[PDB]
């Protein structure tokens, strides 16, 4: 299964939730409509119900470099970001575990394929920081 230091971890599923719609008052860019889009992040428990992702004390969205100040930091669940843009792009979402337990770079794809869509990612989380272990208890076994 896992090996070495990675044995002392548990897995959680986080769900990234994306929404987007066209802003008609914003002029299209080269005929492409400008859309308002939003990303949020939740945690899933052992039953698959959505609970606040309190296991992170910080989330940073690393946006495409066409945005001003493309690295956007949020500290409260659900770490909701909102922007306007003309194009889809892969972006990295850095999530920072409580108690400096570690940064995880989760691959997201911002796209306009649907009005809304959800994507799940499995992350490994260590069990050696008491406050994080205690918080992890709310979303499933540890």
């Amino acid at each position: 299964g896992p090996l070495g230091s990675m044995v002392a971890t548990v897995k959680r599923t986080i769900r990234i939730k994306t929404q987007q719609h066209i802003l008609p008052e914003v002029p299209p860019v080269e005929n492409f409509p400008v859309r308002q889009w939003s990303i949020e992040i939740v945690l899933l428990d052992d039953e698959g119900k959505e609970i606040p992702a309190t296991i992170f004390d910080k989330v940073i969205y690393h946006l495409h470099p066409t945005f001003a100040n493309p690295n956007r930091t949020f500290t409260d669940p659900p770490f909701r970001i909102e922007e306007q843009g003309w194009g889809g792009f892969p972006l990295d979402i850095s999530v920072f575990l409580l108690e400096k337990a570690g940064e995880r770079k989760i691959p997201h794809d911002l796209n306009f394929l649907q009005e809304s869509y959800e994507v799940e990612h499995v992350i490994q989380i260590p069990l050696n920081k008491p406050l994080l272990t205690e918080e992890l208890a709310k979303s499933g076994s540890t």
């Binding site: 492409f32 495409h64 194009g87 889809g88 796209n111 306009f112 649907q114």
Partner: peptide
């Protein structure tokens, strides 16, 4: 809906 940027 398939509009995308570069990298």
């Amino acid at each position: 809906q398939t509009a995308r940027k570069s990298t």
